[PDB]
Amino acid sequence: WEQYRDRVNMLQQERIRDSPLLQAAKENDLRLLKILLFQQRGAVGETALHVAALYDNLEAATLLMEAAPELAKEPALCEPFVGQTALHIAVMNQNLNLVRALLARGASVSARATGAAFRRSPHNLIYYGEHPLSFAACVGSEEIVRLLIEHGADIRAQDSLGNTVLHILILQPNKTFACQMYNLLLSYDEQSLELVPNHQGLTPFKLAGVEGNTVMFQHLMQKRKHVQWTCGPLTSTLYDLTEIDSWGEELSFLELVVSSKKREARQILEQTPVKELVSFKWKKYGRPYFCVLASLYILYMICFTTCCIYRPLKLRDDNRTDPRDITILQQKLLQEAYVTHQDNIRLVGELVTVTGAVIILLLEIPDIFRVGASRYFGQTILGGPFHVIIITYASLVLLTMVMRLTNMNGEVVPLSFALVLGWCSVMYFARGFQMLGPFTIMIQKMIFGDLMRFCWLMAVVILGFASAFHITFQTEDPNNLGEFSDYPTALFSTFELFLTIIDGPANYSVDLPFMYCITYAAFAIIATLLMLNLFIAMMGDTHWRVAQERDELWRAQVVATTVMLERKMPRFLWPRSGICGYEYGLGDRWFLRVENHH
Amino acid sequence: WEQYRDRVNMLQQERIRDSPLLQAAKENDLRLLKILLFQQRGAVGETALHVAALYDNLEAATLLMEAAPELAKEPALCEPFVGQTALHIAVMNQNLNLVRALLARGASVSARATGAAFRRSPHNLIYYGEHPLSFAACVGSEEIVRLLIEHGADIRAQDSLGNTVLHILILQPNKTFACQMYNLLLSYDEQSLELVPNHQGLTPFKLAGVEGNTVMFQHLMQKRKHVQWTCGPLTSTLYDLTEIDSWGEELSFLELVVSSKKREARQILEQTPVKELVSFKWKKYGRPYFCVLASLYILYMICFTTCCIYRPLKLRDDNRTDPRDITILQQKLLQEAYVTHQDNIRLVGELVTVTGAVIILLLEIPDIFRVGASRYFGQTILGGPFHVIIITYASLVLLTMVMRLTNMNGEVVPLSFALVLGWCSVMYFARGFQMLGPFTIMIQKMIFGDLMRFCWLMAVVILGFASAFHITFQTEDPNNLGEFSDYPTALFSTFELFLTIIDGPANYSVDLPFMYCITYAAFAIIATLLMLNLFIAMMGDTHWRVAQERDELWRAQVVATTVMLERKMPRFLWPRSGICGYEYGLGDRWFLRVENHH
Ligand SMILES: C[C@H](OC(=O)C[C@@H]1Sc2ccccc2NC1=O)c1nc2scc(-c3ccccc3)c2c(=O)[nH]1
Ligand SMILES: C[C@H](OC(=O)C[C@@H]1Sc2ccccc2NC1=O)c1nc2scc(-c3ccccc3)c2c(=O)[nH]1
């Protein structure tokens, strides 16, 4: 954890303090090293050249390298810093004379430094790989990368987690150094670099997509863009799509780019060469499958509710000689569901309900292991809080159907719950309407944004005031003042008086204790005037602030539902995307053109 | 008061008008003073050189100083202006030749001017101390402070209220003169200046903290910041903390900086060298003590409410031969609380309630005299309106427990009130939740921002309309139209009809007077359509305006609760902050490092 780097840094400062060699190296004097005139480690992995290269002392570097020739060719102890080449340390400080003298001594330019501070991790800040070439090409030393590649410093290589120098240069906050170094490393390759995967299994194109570097994405696209006729204003250009649509792999680029946990992947979809394709797909074959499947799901759910509304009956058997026993029906035995001939179609409806539940479970069971569990449960782009309520509705319908087949009493307790869950399951289908798009995404944001806070602050006030009212009314007879008879219905009545549905409990034939009157007068201005209206104002404030993000999230999830319902249906029905090129002689590469106007 | 300075200024203008000496001094002519050719006061403390230095007349200054040599070495009458050195007057106007000629005459450069217009007070505007060196170093005369310190003008000194020249230079709206003069006065010190307290008892570091001058705080910190290895992008720097964490004094710097009445002390906490420390403390040992103490307080309060819900009973003794007598229970004698064996644990619960009240009173009794009464009662950072309701709940539980032990009738009147107060006391514990943080601070701002105004304007309308309805319904029999029987329940029914809980009083078997109908139709559109909705809109407007301040206030109070629950618990459990330096040889100075990235 993070009480480790401080301790080893203080120990390293102790070890540079005590020994006069490294202390004079940090001092960079004249009559120190010659007056003294080696392979001893520091606190953890540091020789004499390391602190000299770290504090940029050229004369000390030259004096030590002409004193001991073998000392530059020496790695460090590897407990917090594996390898720790002096070249790799000095290239970050970027001294021309120092890197030239180090290559004159001829250090191992193909070294490897998989240190504990050298890893793609949220602990460290920099992620620079484990190579001096990667260090130079990510810092931006354009005059030094040529001297590094002069001695052939392994233009293709792996490291810890096995990515490459191009992925290192991509995964970086961009600048001019990034684009110039990308062009440089692409030129100095002389299939071998743009095609190599990693141990995460990604093409550099797809890794730039899953990160979100839009300018690197466009500068990689612009090397694969052939131009047709350009008549004045309008320009008809062409794009390649064999990277953007693999259609034979495990994870497509369009499917992977929507599934990241990073909150910048969604902005990649408004760039042209994926936006035109997804808008063509959504204008032709997105809606005329989604809407008809939604209509069939509407018909299935209304068939389920009109089948469940005809629940069978039996009259009462035991008497009700206690005045609060109103149970006028009961559920009869299993033998009489097939006795009446006006219920065979009702059993057919129960069969189609349980068949729909089984088929939706069998569809969604492989849909749980494609990308991660939190990638499928909480990503509002893919629709997590619709998936969980769909699978809960399916499992509860299965449980209540096997309870019906086992013929036990009290079946309505899963029935009403599964019925309201399956009917609110329709709200997933509000992605194919321009009106119904942002409103559901607003309510999905709004629940876990503020209704959680409002319920968490309402609960303590209501739990206080219900107990207060019950203490003040336990000395009161309940046959006239009906409310607050026992404690749970007092809790419920206070909840209702909070949300102002029920009227205030008042009988105008007798007198009421004044403590109730003063406490209810306090409760009115602490609940109904204040907190409900403040909740309304707070949700108006937060709607004013995140009205910007809803349309971007809606575009992200419509591209998500297009790629999901492209992957799901078999390829006998969905067309092959784009136009083929074998009838025009380019050869087995599908292509697309856009007609822009600059 | 403020009808004093005007009178003495008019008298001073009278005294410069009447005497031709000072009038020619203000005139600055040639053939006036030589044609006339002294120690007479003005209206209150003014000789001839004072008005000359005040109106910047160099030839008059030279002529008077070569006429009378002793006259420059002369203070003034001290009733509104004590001392009033001519050097101290002239240094504000900042004339080089005049200050050089005054030092050539050799005035008392170590003078002292504790005038009525010279004090740290909200009456005056400038607070410049009582020294010419302080005057020069706060004005910004960088070419004149050297000539002042040339004759050794007491680089360390006190004044009225006993602060120093460095505190004078700190307590000022900053500019370039301030930072350059701070560096100058630190250099010209040759433990003696950075360590001296005042008669308020503050180090200059702590006084700059309690004022709020962030740039002076950082320029004082930057003289105590040693730098470790700087490898390219990332930089590992070190801070000293023996000023920021005294841990042996009466008032720590972090404890004092949150307790000021100034509304700029809260912005100091987003500066790095205190922010990293308080975030480390809140991430390690802030929440895992606060949350478990909150859970134990939740358990104590729910034990209190489940003990109070089992209030003992006795049936009615006197009959109810009047139709509005519903009192079906009564509180029995003290002898039967220990009669039943199903109430010993209830008496145990009453004992733990009164023990919790006694222990919370014994904890909060020394917490009332640490910083001031209004510093502890109204500062929303420290939590005043939670402290007062906690101590009120404790005192009222003590009163109702001694009333139970004395066995008097009518005990529920403090019981319900203390119960609702102790249950709303949980709302203090919404500081350790990122969701529950700003919402409670919004409601605490909102009550005393606008609900006061809305209640103050609602009261007069409701007091009018209740009297109107009661006058119109005193000619009506109450056995059918139950509402508005007597005046207080008419007041309450109008309050309820304002806040729209109860429905409108209507019986559809008889007729009602038309004055009621027209007045209730006026009351509807003057209350429910208009004023409730306008209150909703006003609180939405003010939420839109002070949505900015809530997160800053929340950061301020989380640093406040960290320093308070660091000071409160004994030091056997809380760790010593930071890392020690004796095992690394620096010596008895705890230190901290930060890993920034520029
Ligand atoms: C929208 C959803 O409808 C419900 O209320 C249904 C049930 S009723 C319930 C009753 C007592 C205790 C927990 C319940 N929970 C339900 O889910 C809903 N809205 C909200 S807002 C804040 C919460 C919450 C989160 C964590 C713990 C306790 C409450 C919440 C919630 O749990 N559900
Ligand atoms: C939030 C608090 O709950 C209460 O109402 C409880 C009691 S009822 C009451 C009845 C008649 C007269 C005074 C009362 N006071 C209470 O405190 C609360 N909210 C507000 S808004 C404006 C005021 C206010 C301030 C100064 C004088 C009169 C009223 C106020 C208040 O005093 N208390």
Side-chain angles (χ1 to χ4, degrees), chain A residues 1-5 7-18 20-21 24-27 38-40 42-43 45 47-55 57-73 75-76 80-83 86-87 89-91 94-104 106-129 131-141 144-153 156-168 170 172-173 176-180 182-209 212-242 244-249 251-262 264-320 323-335 337 344-354 356-364 366 368-374 376-404 406-410 412-598, chain B residues 1-5 7-18 20-21 24-27 38-40 42-43 45 47-55 57-73 75-76 80-83 86-87 89-91 94-104 106-129 131-141 144-153 156-168 170 172-173 176-180 182-209 212-242 244-249 251-262 264-320 323-335 337 344-354 356-364 366 368-374 376-404 406-410 412-598:
Chain A
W1 63 102
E2 297 95 48
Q3 266 183 335
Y4 204 67
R5 308 178 178 184
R7 182 178 292 173
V8 294
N9 274 133
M10 294 336 273
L11 203 71
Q12 203 153 321
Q13 289 322 110
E14 177 50 89
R15 202 44 63 93
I16 193 176
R17 214 172 308 117
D18 47 49
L21 283 79
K26 191 179 168 298
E27 184 47 59
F38 291 95
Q39 278 276 357
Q40 42 196 351
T47 177
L49 272 71
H50 287 322
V51 307
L54 185 55
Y55 280 115
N57 302 336
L58 279 172
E59 53 93 14
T62 53
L63 217 56
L64 275 173
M65 285 157 50
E66 299 324 293
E70 273 293 280
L71 185 49
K73 296 180 178 67
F81 320 116
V82 191
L87 199 56
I89 283 297
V91 61
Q94 201 182 333
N95 276 34
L96 166 85
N97 283 113
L98 169 53
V99 67
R100 193 154 281 145
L102 278 186
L103 270 304
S108 73
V109 75
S110 187
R112 184 202 89 262
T114 167
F118 303 131
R119 200 180 297 260
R120 172 74 175 274
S121 301
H123 277 67
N124 277 80
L125 309 182
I126 43 175
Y127 176 44
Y128 277 10
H131 278 85
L133 197 141
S134 68
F135 290 173
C138 82
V139 162
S141 81
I144 309 296
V145 288
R146 304 185 191 86
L147 191 145
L148 263 66
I149 60 186
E150 172 59 45
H151 301 341
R156 59 182 68 86
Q158 314 305 316
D159 64 315
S160 77
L161 288 189
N163 77 309
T164 179
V165 59
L166 214 62
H167 306 158
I168 292 295
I170 281 175
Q172 201 62 39
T176 169
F177 318 130
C179 69
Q180 199 263 325
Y182 184 68
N183 176 40
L184 184 142
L185 289 174
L186 196 53
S187 48
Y188 276 113
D189 188 11
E190 277 309 310
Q191 189 260 340
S192 316
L193 192 47
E194 293 267 2
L195 206 58
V196 54
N198 51 348
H199 284 285
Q200 209 185 305
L202 281 87
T203 289
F205 190 95
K206 313 180 183 185
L207 189 49
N213 203 292
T214 80
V215 302
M216 275 319 174
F217 163 70
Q218 194 166 2
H219 204 281
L220 166 54
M221 188 63 71
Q222 207 173 6
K223 305 234 176 180
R224 298 204 205 106
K225 181 211 77 162
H226 186 264
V227 187
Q228 290 170 2
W229 66 297
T230 76
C231 171
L234 87 171
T235 310
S236 64
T237 80
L238 190 138
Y239 294 144
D240 192 304
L241 64 98
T242 198
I244 216 164
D245 285 325
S246 157
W247 91 278
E249 268 169 47
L251 306 183
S252 297
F253 164 72
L254 192 53
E255 190 266 330
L256 179 48
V257 70
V258 80
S259 44
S260 174
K261 281 88 181 173
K262 260 189 178 55
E264 284 308 304
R266 323 174 288 105
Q267 200 267 331
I268 211 179
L269 304 175
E270 289 186 346
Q271 309 312 108
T272 67
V274 74
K275 195 249 180 178
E276 310 315 282
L277 192 137
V278 300
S279 276
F280 159 73
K281 289 200 176 185
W282 188 251
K283 205 172 187 182
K284 288 317 276 176
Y285 299 119
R287 301 166 72 244
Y289 275 178
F290 196 90
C291 204
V292 45
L293 178 138
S295 198
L296 268 71
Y297 189 90
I298 277 292
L299 290 181
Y300 160 76
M301 182 61 46
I302 206 164
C303 166
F304 159 70
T305 197
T306 194
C307 168
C308 204
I309 209 66
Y310 284 165
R311 183 157 45 96
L313 68 93
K314 194 159 77 76
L315 278 77
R316 205 177 151 82
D317 51 355
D318 190 82
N319 213 44
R320 36 178 159 173
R324 39 187 67 253
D325 192 346
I326 308 299
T327 39
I328 205 64
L329 267 69
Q330 202 261 327
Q331 182 41 251
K332 59 173 175 176
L333 218 65
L334 79 159
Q335 37 85 29
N344 209 46
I345 199 59
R346 179 183 95 89
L347 267 298
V348 161
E350 274 294 329
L351 190 138
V352 78
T353 284
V354 76
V358 162
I359 202 152
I360 198 159
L361 198 80
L362 211 62
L363 179 56
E364 297 270 338
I368 210 60
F369 289 145
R370 210 49 185 187
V371 195
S374 188
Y376 194 75
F377 284 165
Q379 296 333 287
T380 80
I381 323 163
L382 286 174
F386 288 121
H387 297 135
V388 291
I389 62 157
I390 278 175
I391 196 168
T392 294
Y393 149 77
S395 188
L396 205 80
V397 166
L398 180 61
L399 188 144
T400 197
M401 198 53 208
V402 74
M403 192 68 78
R404 166 139 312 194
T406 322
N407 193 264
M408 290 314 137
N409 79 311
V412 302
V413 168
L415 283 161
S416 192
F417 194 72
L419 165 62
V420 61
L421 274 187
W423 255 104
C424 307
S425 171
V426 183
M427 203 179 284
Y428 169 69
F429 283 157
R431 300 182 195 272
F433 275 75
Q434 200 192 93
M435 278 184 287
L436 260 293
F439 193 56
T440 67
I441 307 304
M442 188 62 58
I443 206 168
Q444 181 175 337
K445 191 70 64 68
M446 204 49 69
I447 289 181
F448 315 123
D450 272 352
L451 187 46
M452 175 73 48
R453 293 155 170 172
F454 197 59
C455 172
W456 257 104
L457 198 63
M458 186 183 55
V460 47
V461 186
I462 210 60
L463 195 47
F465 269 100
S467 80
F469 276 10
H470 186 94
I471 282 300
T472 56
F473 277 167
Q474 218 179 34
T475 80
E476 305 316 310
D477 182 74
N479 297 332
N480 297 321
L481 178 45
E483 309 286 330
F484 316 99
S485 304
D486 49 64
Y487 192 65
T489 192
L491 182 73
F492 175 71
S493 161
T494 40
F495 195 89
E496 209 80 28
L497 276 161
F498 202 104
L499 257 175
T500 176
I501 294 75
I502 198 171
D503 289 345
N507 165 266
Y508 273 67
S509 312
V510 291
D511 203 8
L512 307 177
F514 79 108
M515 180 48 67
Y516 151 75
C517 186
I518 186 174
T519 306
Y520 181 51
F523 178 71
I525 79 154
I526 207 57
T528 305
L529 186 46
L530 180 60
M531 223 177 286
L532 179 133
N533 307 333
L534 199 142
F535 168 68
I536 288 191
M538 185 198 39
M539 91 188 314
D541 213 330
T542 194
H543 206 287
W544 165 91
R545 191 166 290 113
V546 302
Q548 170 54 235
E549 300 273 13
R550 47 173 205 194
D551 50 355
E552 192 158 351
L553 212 52
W554 190 70
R555 276 318 197 279
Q557 53 211 311
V558 73
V559 178
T561 195
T562 285
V563 62
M564 192 190 173
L565 271 301
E566 179 84 67
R567 199 261 313 272
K568 196 68 73 67
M569 276 184 184
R571 279 84 174 263
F572 270 114
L573 307 178
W574 263 98
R576 182 57 181 83
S577 180
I579 54 171
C580 303
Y582 192 74
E583 270 71 27
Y584 309 99
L586 317 165
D588 309 0
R589 296 197 310 188
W590 285 260
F591 280 135
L592 191 146
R593 69 177 272 259
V594 296
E595 214 180 13
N596 210 314
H597 167 41
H598 62 86
Chain B
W1 63 102
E2 297 95 48
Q3 266 183 335
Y4 204 67
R5 308 178 178 184
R7 182 178 292 173
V8 294
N9 274 133
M10 294 336 273
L11 203 71
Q12 203 153 321
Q13 289 322 110
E14 177 50 89
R15 202 44 64 93
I16 194 176
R17 214 172 308 117
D18 47 49
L21 283 79
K26 191 179 168 298
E27 184 47 59
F38 291 95
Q39 278 276 357
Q40 41 196 351
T47 177
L49 272 71
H50 287 322
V51 307
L54 185 56
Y55 280 115
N57 302 336
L58 279 172
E59 53 93 14
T62 53
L63 217 56
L64 275 173
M65 285 157 50
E66 299 324 293
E70 273 293 279
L71 185 49
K73 296 180 178 67
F81 320 116
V82 192
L87 199 56
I89 283 297
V91 61
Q94 201 182 333
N95 276 34
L96 166 85
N97 283 113
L98 169 53
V99 67
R100 193 154 281 145
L102 278 186
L103 269 304
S108 73
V109 75
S110 187
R112 184 202 89 262
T114 167
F118 303 131
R119 200 179 297 260
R120 172 74 175 274
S121 301
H123 277 67
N124 277 80
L125 309 182
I126 43 175
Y127 176 44
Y128 277 10
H131 278 85
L133 197 141
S134 68
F135 290 173
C138 82
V139 162
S141 81
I144 309 296
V145 288
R146 304 185 191 86
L147 191 145
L148 263 66
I149 60 186
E150 172 59 45
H151 301 341
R156 59 182 68 86
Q158 314 305 316
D159 64 315
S160 77
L161 288 189
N163 77 309
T164 179
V165 59
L166 214 62
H167 306 158
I168 292 295
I170 281 175
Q172 201 62 39
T176 169
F177 318 130
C179 69
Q180 199 263 325
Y182 184 68
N183 176 40
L184 184 142
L185 289 174
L186 196 53
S187 48
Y188 276 113
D189 188 11
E190 277 309 310
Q191 189 260 340
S192 316
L193 192 47
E194 293 267 2
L195 206 58
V196 54
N198 51 348
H199 284 285
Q200 209 185 305
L202 281 87
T203 289
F205 190 95
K206 313 180 183 185
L207 189 49
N213 203 292
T214 80
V215 302
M216 275 319 174
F217 163 70
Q218 194 166 2
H219 204 281
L220 166 54
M221 188 63 71
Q222 207 173 6
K223 305 234 176 180
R224 298 204 205 106
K225 181 211 77 162
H226 186 264
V227 187
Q228 290 170 2
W229 66 297
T230 76
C231 171
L234 87 171
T235 310
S236 64
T237 80
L238 190 138
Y239 294 144
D240 192 305
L241 64 98
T242 198
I244 216 164
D245 285 325
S246 157
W247 91 278
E249 268 169 47
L251 306 183
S252 297
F253 164 72
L254 192 53
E255 190 266 330
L256 179 48
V257 70
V258 79
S259 44
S260 174
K261 281 88 181 173
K262 260 189 178 55
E264 284 308 304
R266 323 174 288 105
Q267 200 267 331
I268 211 179
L269 304 175
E270 289 186 346
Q271 309 312 108
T272 67
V274 74
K275 195 249 180 178
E276 310 315 282
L277 192 137
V278 300
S279 276
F280 159 73
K281 289 200 176 185
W282 188 251
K283 205 172 187 182
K284 288 317 276 176
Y285 299 119
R287 301 166 72 244
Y289 275 178
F290 196 90
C291 204
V292 45
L293 178 138
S295 198
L296 268 71
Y297 189 90
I298 277 292
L299 290 181
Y300 160 76
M301 182 61 46
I302 206 164
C303 166
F304 159 70
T305 197
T306 194
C307 168
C308 204
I309 209 66
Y310 284 165
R311 183 157 45 96
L313 68 93
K314 194 159 77 76
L315 278 77
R316 205 177 151 82
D317 51 355
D318 190 82
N319 213 44
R320 36 178 159 173
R324 39 187 67 253
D325 192 346
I326 308 299
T327 39
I328 205 64
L329 267 69
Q330 202 261 327
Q331 182 41 251
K332 59 173 175 176
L333 218 65
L334 79 159
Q335 37 85 29
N344 209 46
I345 199 59
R346 179 183 95 89
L347 268 298
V348 161
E350 274 294 329
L351 190 138
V352 78
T353 284
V354 76
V358 162
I359 202 152
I360 198 159
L361 198 80
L362 212 62
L363 179 56
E364 297 270 338
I368 210 60
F369 289 145
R370 210 49 185 187
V371 195
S374 188
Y376 194 75
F377 284 165
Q379 296 333 287
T380 80
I381 323 163
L382 286 174
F386 288 121
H387 297 135
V388 291
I389 62 157
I390 278 175
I391 196 168
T392 294
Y393 149 77
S395 189
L396 205 80
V397 166
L398 180 61
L399 188 144
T400 197
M401 198 53 208
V402 74
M403 192 68 78
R404 166 139 312 194
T406 322
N407 193 264
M408 290 314 137
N409 79 311
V412 302
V413 168
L415 283 161
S416 192
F417 194 72
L419 165 62
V420 61
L421 274 187
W423 255 105
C424 307
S425 171
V426 183
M427 203 179 284
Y428 169 69
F429 283 157
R431 300 182 195 272
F433 275 75
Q434 200 192 93
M435 278 184 287
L436 260 293
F439 193 56
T440 67
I441 307 304
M442 188 62 58
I443 206 168
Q444 181 175 337
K445 191 70 64 68
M446 204 49 69
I447 289 181
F448 315 123
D450 272 352
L451 187 46
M452 175 73 48
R453 293 155 170 172
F454 197 58
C455 172
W456 257 104
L457 198 63
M458 186 183 55
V460 47
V461 186
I462 210 60
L463 195 47
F465 269 100
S467 80
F469 276 10
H470 187 94
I471 282 300
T472 56
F473 277 167
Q474 218 179 34
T475 80
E476 305 316 310
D477 182 74
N479 297 332
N480 297 321
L481 178 45
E483 309 286 330
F484 316 99
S485 304
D486 49 64
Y487 192 65
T489 192
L491 182 73
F492 175 71
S493 162
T494 40
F495 195 89
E496 209 80 28
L497 276 161
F498 202 104
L499 257 175
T500 176
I501 294 75
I502 198 171
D503 289 345
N507 165 266
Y508 273 67
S509 312
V510 291
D511 204 8
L512 307 177
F514 79 108
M515 180 48 67
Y516 151 75
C517 186
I518 186 174
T519 306
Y520 181 51
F523 178 71
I525 79 154
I526 207 57
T528 305
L529 186 46
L530 180 60
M531 223 177 286
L532 179 133
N533 307 333
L534 199 142
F535 168 68
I536 288 191
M538 185 198 39
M539 91 188 314
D541 213 330
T542 194
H543 206 287
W544 165 91
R545 191 166 290 113
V546 302
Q548 170 54 235
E549 300 273 13
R550 47 173 205 194
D551 50 355
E552 192 158 351
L553 212 52
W554 190 70
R555 276 318 197 279
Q557 53 211 311
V558 73
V559 178
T561 195
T562 285
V563 62
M564 192 191 173
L565 271 301
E566 179 84 67
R567 199 261 313 272
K568 196 68 73 67
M569 276 184 184
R571 279 84 174 263
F572 270 114
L573 307 178
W574 263 98
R576 182 57 181 83
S577 180
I579 54 171
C580 303
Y582 192 74
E583 270 71 27
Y584 309 99
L586 317 165
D588 309 0
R589 296 197 310 188
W590 285 260
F591 280 135
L592 191 146
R593 69 177 272 259
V594 296
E595 214 180 13
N596 210 314
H597 167 41
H598 62 86

